[PDB]
Antibody, heavy 221, light 212 residues
Framework: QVQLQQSGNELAKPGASMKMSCRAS????????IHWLKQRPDQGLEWIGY????????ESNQKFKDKAILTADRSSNTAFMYLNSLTSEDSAVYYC??????????????????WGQGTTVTVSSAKTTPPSVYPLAPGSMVTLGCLVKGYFPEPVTVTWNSGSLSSGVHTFPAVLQSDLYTLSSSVTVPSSTWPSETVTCNVAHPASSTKVDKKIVPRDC | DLVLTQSPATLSVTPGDSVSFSCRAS??????LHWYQQRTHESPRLLIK???QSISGIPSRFSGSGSGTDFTLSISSVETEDFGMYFC?????????FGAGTKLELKRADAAPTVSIFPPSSEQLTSGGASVVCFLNNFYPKDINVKWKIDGSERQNGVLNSWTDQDSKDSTYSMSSTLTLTKDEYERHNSYTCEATHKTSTSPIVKSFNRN
């Protein structure tokens, strides 16, 4: 019943500083090291360092020596990690994990046995900007689309015909660029239903509390 | 300068098959090597430590062997919940490092992509922007290369690509590529082309349009 609970996701402006938390429960907090790892979008895992709560002793990866700072608090069974000068490359998912039981006194496996759920972090200097929804109309089956451009922050909820159209739908993951997100979604219907029958994509961006409906009309040019 | 090399990067298989991932060290690290598994939307999970010692509840089909500079993780009779990413980690020296991973995906028959190209919508041009979108849906395998041509020429910048993960129903992949321009640039030229190369065709798969 061991458990590691990390703070919630977070947005941060460049150059800023950040402090994540990893609360432990289910085992003696001071008896085990807590490791910190970074998983980059390409899925690459990097080891940042570890903290020994019983000693406050720290071992860190040479690559994050002056960028990350680990501390713990016995009183709250929580480990923390502070990221300084937050640049764009610092956007990733960060994990805390427990070192497994030692082999013998002072001899360890350096194998993490219990992990936290992860805490995403996006470094963008943008403001909660609603998106511009553009219709993608073609020039047996037909493919239509919607471009949800320039929003922040995630997520957006795209649907087709309020949900009546669920089959033949592809909604691509959002990609961040110029501190702003861009997503797109496609749907394929029989050519014997469009433009005969109406098709529209419904885009909801909770952060702006904006909801939008865009009808896909054939381009006459 | 201890580099860990995992191969192959992707392993395409059917349930019931047997596979073995390789993880090689650029220097002898004895048996100081552990294996992890990461399924989508989940955090890594320890599978094997010290090259060969399996962890408590790890199904017996997972077997690790190796020593020195060569390690191998095998799964005899792969089940469907074994699909995901597998990483090896050295614990020989500092800093601790991981290999790049090996993805295990579900194999299926090759499928050519259905391609669609869309010119900018008037609604966006009026705001001074021009985004040309190209959808490449339901193909397999995963590897695909998309190139953008404007009047028979290549454009490297302003291109946003996004991929879906393997589909649960038909196991194919999909991708969308957007080329974002200036209402200006967009009007200097006339022919816009989405070009793709995939296993299913020796010649480029093309979709194009002139703004006429």
């Amino acid at each position: 019943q061991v458990q590691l609970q990390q703070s919630g996701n977070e947005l941060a402006k460049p150059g800023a500083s950040m402090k994540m938390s990893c609360r432990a429960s289910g085992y003696s907090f001071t008896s085990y090291w807590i490791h910190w790892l970074k998983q980059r979008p390409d899925q690459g895992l990097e080891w940042i360092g570890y903290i020994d709560p019983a000693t406050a002793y720290t071992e860190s990866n040479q690559k994050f020596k002056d960028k990350a700072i680990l501390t713990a608090d016995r009183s709250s069974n929580t480990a923390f990690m502070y990221l300084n000068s937050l640049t764009s490359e610092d956007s990733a998912v960060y994990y805390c994990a427990r070192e497994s039981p030692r082999l013998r006194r002072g001899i360890y496996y350096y194998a993490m046995d219990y992990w936290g759920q992860g805490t995403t972090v996006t470094v963008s200097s943008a403001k909660t900007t609603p998106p511009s929804v553009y219709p993608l109309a073609p020039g047996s089956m037909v493919t239509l689309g919607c471009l949800v451009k320039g929003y922040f922050p995630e997520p957006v909820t795209v649907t087709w015909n309020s949900g009546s159209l669920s089959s033949g739908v592809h909604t691509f993951p959002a990609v961040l660029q110029s501190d702003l997100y861009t997503l797109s979604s496609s749907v394929t219907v029989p050519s014997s239903t469009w433009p005969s029958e109406t098709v529209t994509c419904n885009v909801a961006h909770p952060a702006s509390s904006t909801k939008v409906d865009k009808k896909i009309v054939p381009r006459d040019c | 300068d201890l580099v860990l090399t995992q191969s192959p990067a992707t392993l395409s298989v059917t349930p019931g098959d047997s596979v073995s991932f390789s993880c090689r060290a650029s220097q002898s690290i004895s048996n100081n090597l552990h294996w992890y598994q990461q399924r989508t939307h989940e955090s890594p999970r320890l599978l094997i430590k010290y090259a060969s010692q399996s962890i408590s509840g790890i199904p017996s089909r997972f077997s690790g062997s190796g020593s020195g500079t060569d390690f191998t993780l095998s799964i005899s009779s792969v089940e469907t919940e074994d699909f995901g990413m597998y990483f090896c980690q050295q614990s020989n020296r500092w800093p601790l490092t991981f290999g790049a991973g090996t993805k295990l995906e579900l194999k299926r028959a090759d499928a050519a992509p259905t391609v669609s190209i869309f010119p900018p919508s008037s609604e966006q041009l009026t705001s001074g922007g021009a985004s040309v979108v190209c959808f490449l849906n339901n193909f397999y395998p995963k590897d695909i290369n998309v190139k953008w041509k404007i009047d028979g020429s290549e454009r490297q910048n302003g291109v946003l690509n996004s991929w879906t993960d393997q589909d649960s129903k038909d196991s194919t992949y999909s991708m969308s590529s957007t080329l974002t321009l200036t209402k200006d640039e967009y009007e200097r030229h006339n022919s816009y082309t989405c070009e793709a190369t995939h296993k299913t065709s020796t010649s480029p798969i093309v979709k194009s349009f002139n703004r006429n």
